[PDB]
Design an enzyme around this catalytic site. Structure first.
Site, PDB file in Angstrom:
ATOM      1  N   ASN A  26       0.862  -1.190   0.000  1.00 41.61           N
ATOM      2  CA  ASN A  26       0.000   0.000   0.000  1.00 41.61           C
ATOM      3  C   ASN A  26       0.894   1.235   0.000  1.00 41.61           C
ATOM      4  O   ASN A  26       1.568   1.512   0.994  1.00 41.61           O
ATOM      5  CB  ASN A  26      -0.934   0.001   1.212  1.00 41.61           C
ATOM      6  CG  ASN A  26      -1.844   1.246   1.277  1.00 41.61           C
ATOM      7  OD1 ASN A  26      -1.401   2.382   1.084  1.00 41.61           O
ATOM      8  ND2 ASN A  26      -3.122   1.023   1.579  1.00 41.61           N
ATOM      9  N   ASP A  28      -0.042   4.499  -0.650  1.00 45.32           N
ATOM     10  CA  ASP A  28      -0.713   5.658  -0.077  1.00 45.32           C
ATOM     11  C   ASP A  28      -0.312   6.916  -0.847  1.00 45.32           C
ATOM     12  O   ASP A  28       0.328   7.829  -0.310  1.00 45.32           O
ATOM     13  CB  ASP A  28      -0.386   5.804   1.409  1.00 45.32           C
ATOM     14  CG  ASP A  28      -1.603   6.230   2.253  1.00 45.32           C
ATOM     15  OD1 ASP A  28      -2.354   7.151   1.873  1.00 45.32           O
ATOM     16  OD2 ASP A  28      -1.816   5.641   3.350  1.00 45.32           O
ATOM     17  N   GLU A  54      -3.896   1.667  -2.883  1.00 46.67           N
ATOM     18  CA  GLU A  54      -4.153   3.064  -2.531  1.00 46.67           C
ATOM     19  C   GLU A  54      -3.248   3.996  -3.344  1.00 46.67           C
ATOM     20  O   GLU A  54      -2.327   4.663  -2.862  1.00 46.67           O
ATOM     21  CB  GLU A  54      -4.011   3.299  -1.024  1.00 46.67           C
ATOM     22  CG  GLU A  54      -4.723   4.587  -0.571  1.00 46.67           C
ATOM     23  CD  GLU A  54      -4.765   4.763   0.936  1.00 46.67           C
ATOM     24  OE1 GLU A  54      -5.409   5.737   1.385  1.00 46.67           O
ATOM     25  OE2 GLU A  54      -4.162   3.946   1.673  1.00 46.67           O
ATOM     26  N   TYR A 129      -7.727  -3.807  -2.220  1.00 46.56           N
ATOM     27  CA  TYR A 129      -7.665  -2.690  -1.280  1.00 46.56           C
ATOM     28  C   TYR A 129      -9.046  -2.571  -0.653  1.00 46.56           C
ATOM     29  O   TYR A 129      -9.879  -1.836  -1.186  1.00 46.56           O
ATOM     30  CB  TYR A 129      -7.251  -1.416  -1.962  1.00 46.56           C
ATOM     31  CG  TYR A 129      -7.282  -0.199  -1.052  1.00 46.56           C
ATOM     32  CD1 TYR A 129      -6.698  -0.234   0.204  1.00 46.56           C
ATOM     33  CD2 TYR A 129      -7.887   0.986  -1.456  1.00 46.56           C
ATOM     34  CE1 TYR A 129      -6.723   0.857   1.032  1.00 46.56           C
ATOM     35  CE2 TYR A 129      -7.904   2.099  -0.624  1.00 46.56           C
ATOM     36  CZ  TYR A 129      -7.319   2.020   0.610  1.00 46.56           C
ATOM     37  OH  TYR A 129      -7.329   3.111   1.446  1.00 46.56           O
ATOM     38  N   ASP A 168      -3.955  -5.051   1.102  1.00 46.50           N
ATOM     39  CA  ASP A 168      -4.383  -4.341   2.305  1.00 46.50           C
ATOM     40  C   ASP A 168      -5.824  -4.735   2.573  1.00 46.50           C
ATOM     41  O   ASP A 168      -6.746  -4.255   1.915  1.00 46.50           O
ATOM     42  CB  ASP A 168      -4.232  -2.834   2.107  1.00 46.50           C
ATOM     43  CG  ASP A 168      -4.596  -2.024   3.348  1.00 46.50           C
ATOM     44  OD1 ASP A 168      -5.206  -2.564   4.284  1.00 46.50           O
ATOM     45  OD2 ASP A 168      -4.256  -0.826   3.384  1.00 46.50           O
ATOM     46  N   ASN A 170      -7.337  -4.357   5.513  1.00 45.02           N
ATOM     47  CA  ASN A 170      -7.930  -3.415   6.461  1.00 45.02           C
ATOM     48  C   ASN A 170      -8.619  -4.123   7.637  1.00 45.02           C
ATOM     49  O   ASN A 170      -9.767  -3.839   7.980  1.00 45.02           O
ATOM     50  CB  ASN A 170      -8.887  -2.466   5.732  1.00 45.02           C
ATOM     51  CG  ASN A 170      -8.250  -1.070   5.488  1.00 45.02           C
ATOM     52  OD1 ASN A 170      -7.616  -0.514   6.386  1.00 45.02           O
ATOM     53  ND2 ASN A 170      -8.414  -0.519   4.279  1.00 45.02           N
ATOM     54  N   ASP A 241      -1.772  -6.028   6.032  1.00 39.84           N
ATOM     55  CA  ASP A 241      -1.468  -6.462   4.683  1.00 39.84           C
ATOM     56  C   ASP A 241      -1.101  -7.948   4.721  1.00 39.84           C
ATOM     57  O   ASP A 241      -0.258  -8.360   5.521  1.00 39.84           O
ATOM     58  CB  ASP A 241      -0.328  -5.627   4.131  1.00 39.84           C
ATOM     59  CG  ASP A 241      -0.626  -4.121   4.187  1.00 39.84           C
ATOM     60  OD1 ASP A 241      -1.292  -3.631   3.253  1.00 39.84           O
ATOM     61  OD2 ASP A 241      -0.178  -3.437   5.140  1.00 39.84           O
ATOM     62  N   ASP A 266       2.991   4.894   4.978  1.00 40.70           N
ATOM     63  CA  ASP A 266       2.665   4.435   6.315  1.00 40.70           C
ATOM     64  C   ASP A 266       2.407   2.925   6.360  1.00 40.70           C
ATOM     65  O   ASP A 266       2.196   2.379   7.450  1.00 40.70           O
ATOM     66  CB  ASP A 266       1.490   5.239   6.907  1.00 40.70           C
ATOM     67  CG  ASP A 266       0.261   5.208   6.047  1.00 40.70           C
ATOM     68  OD1 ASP A 266       0.325   4.666   4.933  1.00 40.70           O
ATOM     69  OD2 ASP A 266      -0.786   5.719   6.485  1.00 40.70           O
ATOM     70  N   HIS A 267       2.467   2.239   5.220  1.00 34.86           N
ATOM     71  CA  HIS A 267       2.606   0.789   5.169  1.00 34.86           C
ATOM     72  C   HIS A 267       3.999   0.448   4.672  1.00 34.86           C
ATOM     73  O   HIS A 267       4.599   1.219   3.911  1.00 34.86           O
ATOM     74  CB  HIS A 267       1.599   0.129   4.217  1.00 34.86           C
ATOM     75  CG  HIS A 267       0.175   0.411   4.542  1.00 34.86           C
ATOM     76  ND1 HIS A 267      -0.686  -0.556   5.017  1.00 34.86           N
ATOM     77  CD2 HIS A 267      -0.552   1.553   4.441  1.00 34.86           C
ATOM     78  CE1 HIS A 267      -1.879  -0.020   5.198  1.00 34.86           C
ATOM     79  NE2 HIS A 267      -1.824   1.261   4.859  1.00 34.86           N
TER      80      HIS A 267
END
Ligand code: CA
Ligand code: NA
Length: 276
Positions: A26, A28, A54, A129, A168, A170, A241, A266-267
């Site tokens: 991911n 981001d 993402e 995602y 990801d 989530n 993930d 941030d991943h």
DNA sequence: TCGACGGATCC
DNA sequence: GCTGATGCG
DNA sequence: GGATCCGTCGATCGCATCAGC
């Protein structure tokens, strides 16, 4: 506590060498991740398939550096239809897959550019995602509708060919999968409804959690840390993930890695080795 | 994620 | 072109 | 009856986009 991923295990439990390296990440914001040198890391890791989540980038704005990846020349993208700089996923492969589709075969859930499906000789790969349940759980109702539709769809796939699902998802499945389970039981990613949904996805398709099959007892192993409060340096994170595998690919599993040191997002990346 | 705040609960 | 918001995580 | 636990709150970081001028 901090966590050191153990060295890459590149031999199957039957002595066969790994022949495929899948890396999921991911990013981001693809454009920002490029500027933070994330493709430099991909070049060194040299995978056969790259799955990015993402992406926050329409295809007509795809950065020019994606044209400088010789070992990943086959590229496929899914953007949302309405929203801008929102979701989006990518699947890049060294060799061309046999067939590529998008979404999960359900109109309600194919509008946000979240799922790419690639079929290969020996397996089908889904990169995903999954919709976050949102600040104040104001998407949790939709997310359960997603989990239900996605679980069915994957079962149909895994009944035809061995399935790898990466990306990801989530949710942190068990308490071991995040640093503060006690205080997050009503926050997105660790509600009872998303935890159960994950357990149901594992039990129904069925699929194994690659990382947990190999290190069932290993805590402090995470793939996401919030940008706020200096979380990453304290290893206050979530395991979000996953490589999910068909049970019939488990004899082929060499290793499932968490690339904790690789920055840009941030991943962090995860990478899977399989002997096929 | 973390701190500050009030309001239980604990032997 | 700057600044500081929003939506979403 | 001093300490500790409890459940709310607000703000915090970053990307991509937009409002306003
Ligand atoms: Ca003015
Ligand atoms: Na906006």
């Amino acid at each position: 506590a901090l966590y050191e991923d153990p060295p890459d295990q590149k031999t199957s439990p039957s002595g066969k060498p790994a022949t495929l390296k899948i890396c999921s990440w991911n990013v981001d914001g693809l454009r920002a991740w490029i500027k933070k040198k994330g493709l430099d890391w991909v070049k060194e890791e040299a995978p056969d398939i790259l799955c990015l989540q993402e992406t926050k980038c329409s295809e007509n704005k795809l950065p020019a550096e994606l044209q400088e990846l010789p070992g990943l020349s086959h590229q496929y993208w899914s953007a949302p239809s309405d929203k801008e700089g929102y979701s989006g996923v990518g699947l890049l492969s060294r060799q061309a897959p046999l067939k590529v589709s998008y979404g999960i075969g359900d109109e309600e859930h194919d509008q946000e550019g979240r799922v790419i499906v690639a079929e290969f000789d020996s397996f089908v790969l889904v990169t995903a995602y999954v919709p976050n349940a949102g600040r104040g759980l104001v998407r949790l109702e939709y997310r359960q509708r997603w989990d239900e539709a996605f679980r069915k769809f994957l079962k149909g796939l895994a009944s035809r060919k061995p399935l790898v699902l990466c990306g990801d998802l989530n949710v942190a499945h068990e308490e071991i999968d995040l640093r503060n389970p006690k205080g997050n039981k009503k926050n997105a990613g660790f509600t009872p409804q998303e935890r159960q949904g994950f357990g149901e996805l594992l039990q129904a398709v069925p699929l194994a959690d690659s990382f947990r099959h190999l290190y069932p007892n290993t805590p402090y192993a995470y793939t996401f840390w919030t940008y706020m409060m200096n979380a990453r340096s304290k290893n206050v994170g979530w395991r979000l993930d996953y490589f999910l595998l068909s049970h019939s690919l488990l004899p082929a599993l060499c290793d499932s890695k968490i690339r904790s040191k690789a920055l840009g997002s941030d991943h962090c990346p995860i990478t899977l080795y399989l002997a096929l």
